[PDB]
Amino acid sequence: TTNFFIPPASVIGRGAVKEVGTRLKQIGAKKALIVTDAFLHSTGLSEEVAKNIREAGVDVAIFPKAQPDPADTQVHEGVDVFKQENCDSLVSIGGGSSHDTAKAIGLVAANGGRINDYQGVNSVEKPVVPVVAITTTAGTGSETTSLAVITDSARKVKMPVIDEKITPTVAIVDPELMVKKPAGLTIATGMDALSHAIEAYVAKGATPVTDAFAIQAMKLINEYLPKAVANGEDIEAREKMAYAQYMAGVAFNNGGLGLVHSISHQVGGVYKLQHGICNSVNMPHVCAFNLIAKTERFAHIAELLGENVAGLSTAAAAERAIVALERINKSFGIPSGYAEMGVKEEDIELLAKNAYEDVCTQSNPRVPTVQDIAQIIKNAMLE
Amino acid sequence: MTTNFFIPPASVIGRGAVKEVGTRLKQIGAKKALIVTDAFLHSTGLSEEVAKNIREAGVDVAIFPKAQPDPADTQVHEGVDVFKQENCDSLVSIGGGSSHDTAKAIGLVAANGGRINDYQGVNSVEKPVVPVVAITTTAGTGSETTSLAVITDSARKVKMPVIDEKITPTVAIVDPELMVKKPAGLTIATGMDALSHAIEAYVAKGATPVTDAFAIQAMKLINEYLPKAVANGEDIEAREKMAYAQYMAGVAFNNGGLGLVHSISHQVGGVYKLQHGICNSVNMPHVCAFNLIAKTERFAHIAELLGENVAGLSTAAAAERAIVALERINKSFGIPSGYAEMGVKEEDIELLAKNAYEDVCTQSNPRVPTVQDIAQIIKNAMLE
Amino acid sequence: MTTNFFIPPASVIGRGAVKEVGTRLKQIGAKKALIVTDAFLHSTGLSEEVAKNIREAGVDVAIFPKAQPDPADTQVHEGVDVFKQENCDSLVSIGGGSSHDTAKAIGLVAANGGRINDYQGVNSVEKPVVPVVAITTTAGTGSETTSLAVITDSARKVKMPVIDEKITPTVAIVDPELMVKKPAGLTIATGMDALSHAIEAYVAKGATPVTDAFAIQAMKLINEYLPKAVANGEDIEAREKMAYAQYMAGVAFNNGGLGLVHSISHQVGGVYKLQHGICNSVNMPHVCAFNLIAKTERFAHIAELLGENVAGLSTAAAAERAIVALERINKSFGIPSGYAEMGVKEEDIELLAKNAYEDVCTQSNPRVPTVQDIAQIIKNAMLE
Amino acid sequence: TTNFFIPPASVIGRGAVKEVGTRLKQIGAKKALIVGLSEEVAKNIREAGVDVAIFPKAQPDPVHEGVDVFKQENCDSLVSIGGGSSHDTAKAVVPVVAITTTAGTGSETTSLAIDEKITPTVAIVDPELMVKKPAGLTIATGMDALSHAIEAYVAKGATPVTDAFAIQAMKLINEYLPKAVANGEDIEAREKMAYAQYMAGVAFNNGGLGLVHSISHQVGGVYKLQHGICNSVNMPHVCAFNLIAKTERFAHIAELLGENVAGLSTAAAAERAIVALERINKSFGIPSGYAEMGVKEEDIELLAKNAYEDVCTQSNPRVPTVQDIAQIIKNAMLE
Ligand SMILES: [Mn+2]
Ligand SMILES: [Mn+2]
Ligand SMILES: [Mn+2]
Ligand SMILES: [Mn+2]
């Protein structure tokens, strides 16, 4: 008895943004709060989106106070604006920060409380405000997830908030908005997409449904991600990566992740490094730790990342996945180890301990000890 | 490019999922649900089991058990009246595609007015329809994930498709334990219709990477386990794998599209009153062979996914192997050798063919057809 | 899940194993044995040599040489009488499956009372039975290790299966040296029945990893050495290997089950008085083709274990190579081409099928049958 | 003439512990003496009309005081719960019912504590009782089971009967032992490991063991270490020593442990067996040598001597000298 949670309406493809208003009109929206970063508000994309929405008889207001690593303070600022403007819907424009902020605003405005009071897994009881998420990056997949991560203000800890009700109501994935992404950013986000697909395939809670999307995501990523890193104007590469991010997000949201994300959450937060790059640096060693758990699947992954496994044993084909991960990492210039990125040995223990406590660690195919995590990070320190 | 993906936002696929109905109904804000089912399931008690679950959870329920195979306009409007009298705020469908589609039509017409035959085709209706919770008892149809209801008009003796995004079910309940007692023939028909759904979705014109995901995985699962369920219906793992397969094929053809298999089967099964799955199974080999020039590569892939070793073959050879795979499956499941034995008359071919031309599926078929093309397909599907 | 595994606690396999009977019978602690055997065996004098071992151990002995092919209910109740008359405390069985089944049935009825027919089907006898030491002279049956006794009904002509954990022998003696003088036809019948046991247990519904182990080994050994033993009976190595394969196939089908092969041959041999292994070999390719859709992967494995090169082949193709291999072996041993040459008449088919449907084994069959399915199997095996 | 001794009744699978009393019933037992699982077991026993008593003295290593203590509370039948220790202690013909909590040892199916009358009357293998086994216990116990299967397949007294169970044990272990090491809450993995332990145990009881156990009996006795881990450390070098004896079967073992020996000579295929065992050792974190476990060179000689007189050395496919055993121990000290 497994649950499958996906946005009931998704528009994916060139020009998809042009349908925000249309989509909000079907949900029956009267007025929408747009949540974005200050920069996108300066680019004018927020204004174009608001125009489209208002054309469909849906009023709009803007909350350009989203920041990277969203915080409860701004979440509640946005709930305040929601109430003052008398909004009935939320629309998010940007990366994961915008999306998670919007989801938290909706949760608190419908069921009340502090977003602090929603840490952990929740079964909120009130009807929740619809959220329409427009993605501008090909990674994260937050337009399809039931998870928002908000940082506590006082305690400087991050809080995961999981509920089937924050699962966005409309997901708009337009590749055209992703074209001006620089090459390094494309690398980071695409490697996080690959991270999602690989972790979902070997996840403890993988269903055949999750595996469908995960496998197709690995196929599409393997072909076009280098092409999108090479020429960002290649709209076909951008479109295949858009679909790949979507499928990978659904896959990990319902199936699960693991130590890759657990480790890189701590490493990135502490050392202020990019999510995708940390994920890519530690994935080859995490998968080695996980090899005994899902051997057949890691052989399949080696084949899906583009290796000739014919005439190989399932153990050999499994290890070829690690070889492929290092091949990809070398092609996109991922750092050689964590040490280059500034990780200090004296911190590993902490990084391990906190990573042991992450919600992601529970879906990892191999049950870990704090020392297992520590040894993973140590092996990832330098090549 | 401006492609829409509609899917039930919540699905519970697993053993004992039926018990979740009320809970999920509670999470939509439902107060009074109307249960729409057939007559058998009612006599079996399932309607009242579900009803109890609903009532305990705090929701109220009424039972409309007049859904019939080959859903028809009469019962649709009748159940609409019952919906209005009992002042129900939600719908819960328990059974095969008949119950699901009839419930979709009930809620649709309950909101927006006239006869369901008026809402034929693709509709963008503007009044929100009530939530639908669909509990499936067949490893086929896919109706608990589709935005389509097949309401048959006997006034023209044709199964009419009715498509609107609002009749996409809001909760999907796929419990394999309600599918255990399915007799062998029903298992074959449902499973082969699901196979048709995946195969017609893969080669469909509007197929997208997302649809191909579910279509490929459904084909792999069907190949591995559908014979296992046909042999022993009491193997819960086989039933469960087929449940996942059917769900994914439903999503696939809902968002990618079907083709001339379903176009033809609608006419043949509406006129001669035969089972949908077996009609699909008799026509598929020939429809696919017609389509071969359109999607040679993907048909070679189907050959591999349906259990053929296409190593060292031309891509055209590997594609041809898909028809061999299909015919092998057909014989293994005892599918009638031809449409002729099923009672189809050569005289009616044209009128079936011509009418098949007007089904929406012909516009999703990979190869753009002529009425005489379809006629030749139906001719070849008569003997051997 | 929870599975019970019943096996003789002590087994002596190898040349000269018959030397240990009396020894073991003292370790178990017995004083009044009843050598149950046939009369031909009694004239061979084996009766008195085994009795010499037993009387040297210090156990009184009596001989009841009334075991016949198709062991009847009449001789069962008659031997039960002898058991009571000779105040026998222990049973020793010397012969093929007929004698073994007779001795264990004697213990059964002497314990619980009721005649033989009352114990058709699976029973859970509550009255303890006497220890049994089974000395086998045929490389088939495996009845030295089974909880089953195949006794036929007089009137209904049904070789009744009688199953109980209490009748599983306490000591099993497999001496290949007693198997040398077996004619080639008897070697064929017994060995082909052992192959039958291994195959049915591999595809049985109640198959476990333990029973699977034993079935696989039995099939490998049979493929290599049964033809060798059919050619030259004096080859003691081949006879010993066949003894091992029979032991393992007996444990496998005892604790995993059988299927329609034995269901059908029970009726055909009860009605027309025909050899068990021959009937089984005549029906096996057709039973396995029906059951293919259930265990395709395992039938491919069986093709490889019976000596087929399944390289570059689909699992469907490899599974069909199992039928090919079985037909090949049949030809190599001269098995009848069909039941028609064996005198089976189409008129009885219905009855056969009906009574086969009520056999316990049909419930072990991977593919759930109907009476008409069983009928079609028997029909297809009539001629070829 | 070869003998095959096995418990006459074995209940294997999830929930098997429910049949204890049930099986006792067909034994015709009256009371019972069990050598907080104990109380629920006794409740099920009483649920069939069977009186119960308890023997909580279950000292791990062997002893005689506990045997005589049990004798004092005399009873008609015995139930034994735990790993090898409890079974061996209750081995002291009164029926013995053996409930195993580890997927190794196989003592629930053995005639050793050395007589066929101490083979248990009933064997109960419940994977549900093994879920809470920590990863170290899982690795040790499963690797001991693999040791059993491997040693019995190349053993001198092997029969086709024993070879059946040993081959299937090796297959099941190859696929599922890493799965149970990764997530012990996987019931499929633990159930497969249960069946594999049972089969490997029957196989080594009837077919025999070899120099792996000869060496590790001494090493674990002297330095107080884990049986499975010691076996895992010397098995690569022991198998290497035995290669010339059963080269064909070692190539088969390479295949069974997940290697592709296709296109390889029987020699190369045999060497791939050592390659596979070393891979498995590294995947499970086995110590690199006995030296990291605290074994000292000065003792090797004595170890060798004592290992030579173990009966297992007579089952080894290759007949050894004390100096051969000493070389093996030395080679396994460091990597
Ligand atoms: Mn991520
Ligand atoms: Mn259909
Ligand atoms: Mn037989
Ligand atoms: Mn051991």
User: Between β-strands A2-5 and B10-13, what pairing exists: parallel, antiparallel or unpaired?
Assistant: antiparallel
Chain A residues within 8 A of B10 when measuring between CB atoms: 3-5, 164
Distance C188 CA to ligand 3 centre (A): 13
Can you name the residues that pair with A352 across neighbouring β-strands?
A: none
How many residues does this entry show for chain D? 335
Chain C residues within 8 A of B230 when measuring between CB atoms: 293
Coil, helix or strand at residue A172: strand
Instruction: State the nearest Cα–Cα gap between C95 and chain B, in angstroms.
Output: 39
Chain B residues within 8 A of A12 when measuring between CB atoms: 3, 5, 208, 210
Distance C105 CA to ligand 3 centre (A): 17
* Listed residue (D41, D22, D122, D31) closest to D77, CA to CA: D31
Chain B residues within 8 A of C293 when measuring between CB atoms: 227-228, 230-231, 332-333
Q: Does D135 touch chain A (CB under 8 A)?
A: yes
Distance A257 CA to ligand 1 centre (A): 9
D101 near D129, Cβ under 8 Å?
A: yes
Maximum Cα–Cα distance across chain D: 64
Chain A touches chain D, with at least 3 Cβ pairs below 8 Å, answer yes
Question: Inter-chain contact D262–A311, Cβ cutoff 8 Å?
Answer: yes
D243 near D156, Cβ under 8 Å?
A: no
Distance C100 CA to ligand 3 centre (A): 13
Q: At A226, phi and psi to the nearest 5? A: -60, -30
Coil, helix or strand at residue C240: helix
C-alpha radius of gyration, chain B, whole number: 20
Chains sharing 3 or more CB pairs under 8 A with chain C: B, D
Question: Inter-chain contact B232–C291, Cβ cutoff 8 Å?
Answer: no
Chain C residues within 8 A of D197 when measuring between CB atoms: none
The Cα–Cα gap between B263 and B261 comes to 6
Question: Inter-chain contact B9–A167, Cβ cutoff 8 Å?
Answer: yes
**Sequence-distant (≥ 6) Cβ neighbours of residue A346 within 8 angstroms:** none
Question: Inter-chain contact D260–A311, Cβ cutoff 8 Å?
Answer: yes
Q: Burial of A79 by CB count in 10 Å (0-12 exposed, 13-18 middle, 19+ buried)?
A: buried
Q: Which of residues 212-241 of B touch A (CB under 8 A)?
A: 212-214, 216-217, 221, 241
The Cα–Cα gap between A114 and A97 comes to 18
Nearest CB to A15; choose among B2, B5, B7: B2
Indicate which of D133, D143, D283, D286 best probes the interface with A, i.e. most A CBs within 10 Å of its own CB: D283
Question: Inter-chain contact D2–C8, Cβ cutoff 8 Å?
Answer: no
Question: Inter-chain contact B14–A1, Cβ cutoff 8 Å?
Answer: yes
Q: Burial of A122 by CB count in 10 Å (0-12 exposed, 13-18 middle, 19+ buried)?
A: middle
Instruction: State the nearest Cα–Cα gap between C384 and chain D, in angstroms.
Output: 37
A210 near A203, Cβ under 8 Å?
A: yes
Question: Inter-chain contact C248–D198, Cβ cutoff 8 Å?
Answer: no
Size of interface B-C (CB pairs under 8 A): 33
Q: From the CB of residue C169, how many other CB atoms can be counted at a distance below 10 Å?
A: 29
Question: Inter-chain contact D184–A293, Cβ cutoff 8 Å?
Answer: no
Question: Inter-chain contact A292–D184, Cβ cutoff 8 Å?
Answer: no
H/E element, C287? helix C276-290
Question: Inter-chain contact C313–B309, Cβ cutoff 8 Å?
Answer: yes
Can you give chain B as a three-state secondary structure string? CCEEEECCCEEEECCCHHHHHHHHHHHHCCCEEEEECCCHHHHHCHHHHHHHHHHHCCCEEEEECCCCCCCEHHHHHHHHHHHHHCCCCEEEEEECHHHHHHHHHHHHHHHHCCCHHHHCEECCCCCCCCCEEEEECCCCCCCCCCCEEEEEECCCCEEEEEECHHHCCCEEEECHHHHCCCCHHHHHHHHHHHHHHHHHHHCCCCCCHHHHHHHHHHHHHHHHHHHHHHHCCCCHHHHHHHHHHHHHHHHHHHHCCCCHHHHHHHHHHHHHCCCHHHHHHHHHHHHHHHHCCCCHHHHHHHHHHCCCCCCCCCHHHHHHHHHHHHHHHHHHCCCCCCCCCCCCCHHHHHHHHHHHHCCHHHHCCCCCCCHHHHHHHHHHCCCC
Sign of the C-alpha dihedral computed for residues B334, B335, B341 and B342 taken in this order: positive
The Cα–Cα gap between C187 and C192 comes to 8
Q: Which of residues 94-113 of B touch A (CB under 8 A)?
A: none
Distance D9 CA to ligand 3 centre (A): 23
Sign of the C-alpha dihedral computed for residues D181, D187, D192 and D198 taken in this order: positive
Instruction: State the nearest Cα–Cα gap between C217 and chain B, in angstroms.
Output: 26
Check residue C149 and report its DSSP letter: E
Q: Does C297 touch chain B (CB under 8 A)?
A: no
Q: At A4, phi and psi to the nearest 5? A: -120, 120
Question: Inter-chain contact A16–B2, Cβ cutoff 8 Å?
Answer: yes
Instruction: State the nearest Cα–Cα gap between C5 and chain D, in angstroms.
Output: 5
Check residue C11 and report its DSSP letter: E
Nearest CB to A220; choose among B17, B128, B209: B209
Position B89, amino acid = D
How remote is the C-alpha of A300 from its chain's centroid? Answer: 23
H/E element, A358? none
Query: Which regions of chain C does DSSP assign to beta strands (E)?
Result: 3-6, 10-13, 32-37, 60-65, 90-95, 121-122, 132-136, 148-152, 159-163, 171-174
For the CA of B279, the nearest ligand: 2
Chain D residues within 8 A of A314 when measuring between CB atoms: 258
Nearest CB to D260; choose among A293, A313, A367: A313
Check residue C138 and report its DSSP letter: S
Instruction: State the nearest Cα–Cα gap between C373 and chain D, in angstroms.
Output: 34
Which position has the token pair 């990764």?
A: D182
Can you give chain D as a three-state secondary structure string? CEEEECCCEEEECCCHHHHHHHHHHHHCCCCCEECCHHHHHHHHHHCCCCCCEECCCCCCCCCHHHHHHHHHCCCCCEEEEECHHHHHHHCCCCCEEEEECCCCCCHHHCCCCCCHHHCCCEEEECHHHHCCCCHHHHHHHHHHHHHHHHHHHCCCCCCHHHHHHHHHHHHHHHHHHHHHHHCCCCHHHHHHHHHHHHHHHHHHHHHCCCHHHHHHHHHHHHHCCCHHHHHHHHHHHHHHHHCCCCHHHHHHHHHHCCCCCCCCCHHHHHHHHHHHHHHHHHHCCCCCCHHHHCCCHHHHHHHHHHHHHCCHHHHCCCCCCHHHHHHHHHHCCCC
Nearest chain C residue to D9 by CA: give it: C6
Chain D residues within 8 A of C248 when measuring between CB atoms: 160-161, 164
A267 near A364, Cβ under 8 Å?
A: no
* Listed residue (C273, C277, C275, C266) closest to C352, CA to CA: C266
Q: Which of residues 301-320 of D touch C (CB under 8 A)?
A: none
For the CA of B96, the nearest ligand: 2
Position C110, amino acid = A
Experimental technique behind these coordinates: X-ray
Query: Which regions of chain A does DSSP assign to beta strands (E)?
Result: 2-5, 9-12, 31-37, 59-66, 89-94, 120-121, 131-135, 147-151, 158-162, 170-173
User: Between β-strands C3-6 and D9-12, what pairing exists: parallel, antiparallel or unpaired?
Assistant: antiparallel
Q: Does B191 touch chain C (CB under 8 A)?
A: no
Chain B residues within 8 A of C366 when measuring between CB atoms: 231-232
- Six token digits for residue C13: 């396999």
